[PDB]
Structure formats: structure tokens, C-alpha cells
């Protein structure tokens, strides 16, 4: 969990402002929007990186290119690649990062309104964030369904097929015969209704608070839609914070006067915020359990 700054440049003052804004507006809550950046310190291998072994088994299995493992048409023509990545990335194989627990702390301090995650590792939930407060926009492995008729399947049936050596004979629907897959959203597929339904009620929640609101965007390159639309769709009068290594998306396209940009690692960012907030006490507790 140990972290360190990303440059010699200190970011404590910028982080200080965040705590300042929270102290001024005590009865306010925060809306997080995160991505893959917040889970890198957890050891989750990037399938797009030639450094991970996951990437190489994929390359060997003749996958034409990384993102094809999340392509409907490819999965149907050859599901082994996806099954192989599922085996390596299945929930429970990793542990929550310090930033993940920061979300938990916020839930305990009743200052967490919602956390929109585009990650599929489900580390927010695994770290204790309640279901009501989570929006897994790209789905998870917690559910499974037939890609043909939609019948529901217990997540276990898919998981039991992952330990066989080798992996073969995949889960076919016993109603229509098509392949059954985890409730992970693939390119070309739509997101679950709750993504827009929750964003809808959360968009009105924000416009009506203008106890000022605070939306913190962390660890995402904002390159996948429609997820990447939430930021520009933030009430122009609601303060936006960005914790990333590079300034990306709408923060680079149409910067807003009130924008606060913090170039820092998500775990080092968490270390600083919990300091400027003075919650080291409850934090340490959570971290040691």
C-alpha cells in the first residue's frame, strides 16, 4: 500500500483546498467517477501491456488485438481468449487499494453520494462500499446471462469452468444454445439502465444543491463512451476535481475556471486527503482490518 509522490512537486496545497471545500460545506457529499488508474497499485495486469503474462497468452491464443477480448462478435467466434482473461482477472484474486478504502471512509463519514466506476474488478464493493452507492457502468462477474435469449445464470456456473486444464467446452444456454457470459458490458453493447437512471437523479441532485456538492474524477483517461460524458454533463456551477497523471478528457478540452487539477497517484492522493481532513484515526482502523 505504501506510496510516494509522482514528481518532486508537492500537491498537498491543492489537496488542502479539497479538504477546505469540504470543511466549509459540512453537510455536503461527494460524487466519485473512477477508472483503471485506481486499481493499478493492486497488481491487476493490464491486458493491453506486453509486460503482463495475460497479454502474451492472449497473443498466443491468436487474439487479433487487446480490446477484441471484449468484442461480442469475437467472443462468439472464439471465447477461449475471454475465458482466459476471466481466469486471471476474476474478482477475489486481488485486494483493495488505499484509495478504494478512502471511498469506504467517506461512506462512514456519510459524505459519499455515489461512486461511478468503469472498472470491472469490483474492488469498491469488495472494500465495503454499499451496493446502493455503487454504479458499475461496465458490469461485473456477479451476474451471468445468455447472449441469445437472456436467461439468467448463477455466476458460479461460469466460474467453475475457469479451473479446468485446459479450458474447453464453454457454458452454453440450455434454452436456446447460445454462449452464456458474465454481466460485463462489451464494446458495441449498451450499459445497464441504472447507469443513466442514476445519473439522471444525480444530475438533478447536483443542480438542486447549488452544503455545496463536490465531484471528484479519479484514475480515468476518459476515452470510453458513454462513461466519458458525465464530466462535461456536470453542472457548470459545481466544482470539478481531477486526480490523474495527465490532464485528460473534458478537463483538457474545455477547462472550467473553477477546475482543480491534481497530478498525483490515486494512493498518494488518498494519503494526503485523509491528512488534510484529519481522519487518519478512522483511516488507520479501516486499513488494519
Amino acid at each position: 500500500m505504501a506510496s510516494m509522490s509522482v514528481s518532486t512537486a508537492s500537491t498537498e496545497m491543492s489537496v488542502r483546498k479539497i479538504a477546505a471545500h469540504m470543511k466549509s460545506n459540512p453537510n455536503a457529499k461527494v460524487i466519485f467517477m473512477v477508472g483503471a488508474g485506481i486499481s493499478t497499485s493492486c497488481g491487476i495486469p493490464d491486458f493491453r501491456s506486453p509486460g503482463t503474462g495475460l497479454y502474451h497468452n492472449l497473443a498466443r491464443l491468436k487474439l487479433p488485438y487487446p480490446e477484441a477480448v471484449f468484442d461480442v462478435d469475437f467472443f462468439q467466434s472464439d471465447p477461449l481468449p475471454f475465458y482466459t482473461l476471466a481466469k486471471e482477472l476474476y474478482p477475489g484474486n486481488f485486494r483493495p487499494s488505499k484509495f478504494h478504502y478512502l471511498l469506504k471512509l467517506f461512506q462512514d463519514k456519510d459524505v459519499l453520494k455515489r461512486v461511478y466506476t468503469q472498472n470491472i474488478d469490483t474492488l469498491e464493493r469488495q472494500a465495503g462500499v454499499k451496493d446502493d452507492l455503487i454504479i458499475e457502468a461496465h458490469g461485473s462477474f456477479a451476474h451471468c446471462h445468455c447472449i441469445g435469449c437472456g436467461k439468467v445464470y448463477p455466476p458460479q456456473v461460469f466460474k467453475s469452468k475457469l479451473a479446468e486444464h485446459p479450458i474447453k467446452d464453454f457454458v452454453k444456454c440450455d434454452v436456446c444454445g447460445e454462449l452464456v457470459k458474465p454481466a460485463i458490458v462489451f464494446f458495441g453493447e449498451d450499459l445497464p439502465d441504472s447507469f443513466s437512471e442514476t445519473w439522471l437523479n444525480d444530475s438533478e441532485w447536483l443542480r438542486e444543491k447549488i452544503q455545496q456538492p463536490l465531484v471528484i474524477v479519479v484514475g480515468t483517461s476518459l476515452a470510453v463512451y458513454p462513461f466519458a460524458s458525465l464530466p462535461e454533463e456536470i453542472p457548470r456551477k459545481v466544482k470539478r476535481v481531477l486526480c490523474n497523471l495527465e490532464t485528460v478528457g473534458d478537463f483538457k478540452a474545455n477547462k472550467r475556471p473553477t477546475d482543480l487539477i491534481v497530478h498525483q497517484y490515486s494512493d498518494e492522493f488518498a494519503e494526503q486527503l485523509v491528512e488534510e481532513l484529519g481522519w487518519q484515526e478512522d483511516f488507520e482502523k479501516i486499513l488494519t482490518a
Partner: peptide, 8 residues
């Protein structure tokens, strides 16, 4: 609703 999971 946002369209389908994509780029751009």
C-alpha cells in the same frame, strides 16, 4: 441513453 460502449 449514451449509445453503445465505444470510443469517440
Amino acid at each position: 441513453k449514451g449509445g453503445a460502449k465505444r470510443h469517440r
